[PDB]
Enzyme design. Structure first.
Site, mmCIF file in Angstrom:
data_model
loop_
_atom_site.group_PDB
_atom_site.id
_atom_site.type_symbol
_atom_site.label_atom_id
_atom_site.label_comp_id
_atom_site.label_asym_id
_atom_site.label_seq_id
_atom_site.Cartn_x
_atom_site.Cartn_y
_atom_site.Cartn_z
ATOM 1 N N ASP A 138 37.806 39.796 50.012
ATOM 2 C CA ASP A 138 38.368 39.207 51.211
ATOM 3 C C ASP A 138 39.880 39.345 51.192
ATOM 4 O OD1 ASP A 138 36.625 37.504 49.352
ATOM 5 O OD2 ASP A 138 38.408 36.228 49.530
ATOM 6 N N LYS A 140 43.096 39.600 53.588
ATOM 7 C CA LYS A 140 43.497 39.169 54.930
ATOM 8 C C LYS A 140 45.002 38.875 54.956
ATOM 9 C CE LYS A 140 40.546 35.771 54.391
ATOM 10 N NZ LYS A 140 40.559 35.722 52.900
ATOM 11 N N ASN A 143 46.829 36.705 52.521
ATOM 12 C CA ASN A 143 46.907 37.087 51.114
ATOM 13 C C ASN A 143 48.087 38.009 50.800
ATOM 14 O OD1 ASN A 143 43.322 37.489 51.350
ATOM 15 N ND2 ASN A 143 44.466 35.606 50.914
#
Ligand SMILES: CCc1cncnc1N1CCN(Cc2nc3cc(C(F)(F)F)ccc3[nH]2)CC1
Length: 317
Positions: A138, A140, A143
């Site tokens: 994940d 995104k 981050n």
């Protein structure tokens, strides 16, 4: 007069950068010993609640192990790790450029010239993670952060705040069909889309309505896009994992060879010699302009002990 101990009393709490369920992230100043006067980010986690869930204990230890193992220009560096009874501490370098997503809002849209830079730096970090046999899954905009000069740094390899957003995840995560390194080249595609449109490619009225639109996988071509970016996106956001760009034996290299990166010099870019599109506000080092006003607070708040045996760490530098 031996080596330094690295207790919590080694740091002055300056402010809160982020609060979550499992712990807090402070901006701190080292006040004793080696790096006296230097600013860090300090992630403080509550042992009591980590040990309640095996999956939580996994990510905490993983992060700790990952960040010790991985040294890279576009990945956040771990400086110290230490512990008390009940609390765990991670000292990471302080990234004053804030979120990359923050720049996007101000710009409204990234130009392909600017997006390329950030994507290319992100691509290097992602491929290296894969050389170490690690899958961000994940990825995104939350981050991706920026150092003082505006270079990419990847950041949450540990626990999740609030106990996140699915619109950047690959369909195979959602359908639990199993995943691989190609999952990130999907997430890179979703990011690229967000960089150039302002939104994720597939979004819905709610949790599941968003999910279905992703599985549907309908192309949306904004007319202002070049063919290079257009074609690059269509390959990354392929539902088919095997057919996806970066899923091959060349991985990151296969992606980086794309004519959208025809202007990129990797030897220079990795050395971080290339000037970043955004040199962000420079008031001082401890400039905190971009995260708050959201967090502005300043406070720190047992049977089977091991794990967290040998949790302690100090970076060589
Ligand atoms: C430590 C890296 C960083 C470096 N320099 C400046 N800013 C940074 N960050 C990056 C991470 N952060 C988002 C965030 N992650 C969190 C994790 C938790 C957890 F306790 F793990 F649950 C709690 C709150 C959290 N807030 C914002 C401050």
């Amino acid at each position: 007069r031996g080596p330094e101990k690295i207790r919590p009393e080694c740091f002055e709490l300056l402010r809160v950068l982020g609060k979550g369920g499992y712990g807090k992230v402070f901006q701190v100043r080292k006040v004793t010993g080696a790096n006296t006067g230097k600013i860090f980010a300090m992630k403080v986690l509550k042992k009591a609640m980590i040990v309640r869930n095996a999956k939580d204990t996994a990510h905490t230890k993983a992060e700790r192990n990952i960040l010790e193992e991985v040294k890279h220009p576009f990945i956040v560096d771990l400086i110290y790790a230490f512990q008390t009874g009940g609390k765990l501490y991670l000292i990471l370098e302080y990234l004053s450029g804030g979120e990359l997503f923050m720049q996007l809002e101000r710009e409204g849209i990234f130009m392909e010239d600017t997006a390329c830079f950030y994507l290319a730096e992100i691509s290097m970090a992602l491929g290296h993670l894969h050389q170490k046999g690690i899958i961000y899954r994940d990825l995104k905009p939350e981050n991706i952060m920026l150092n003082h000069q505006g270079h990419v740094k990847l950041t949450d390899f540990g626990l999740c705040k609030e106990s996140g957003t699915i619109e950047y995840m690959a369909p195979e995560i959602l359908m639990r069909s199993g995943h691989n390194r190609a999952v990130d080249w999907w997430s890179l595609g979703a990011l690229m889309y967000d960089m150039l449109t302002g939104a994720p490619p597939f979004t819905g009225e709610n949790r599941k309505k968003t999910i279905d639109k992703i599985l549907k996988c309908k192309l949306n071509l904004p007319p202002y896009l070049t063919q290079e970016a257009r074609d690059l996106l269509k390959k990354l956001l392929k539902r088919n994992a095997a057919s996806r760009l970066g899923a091959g034996p060349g991985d990151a290299g296969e992606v980086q060879a794309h004519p959208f990166f025809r202007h990129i010099n990797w030897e220079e870019l990795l050395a971080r010699k290339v000037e970043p599109p955004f040199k962000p506000l420079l008031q001082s080092e401890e400039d905190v302009s971009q995260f708050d006003s959201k967090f502005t607070r300043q406070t720190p708040v047992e049977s089977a002990n091991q794990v967290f045996l040998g949790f302690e760490y100090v970076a060589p530098s």
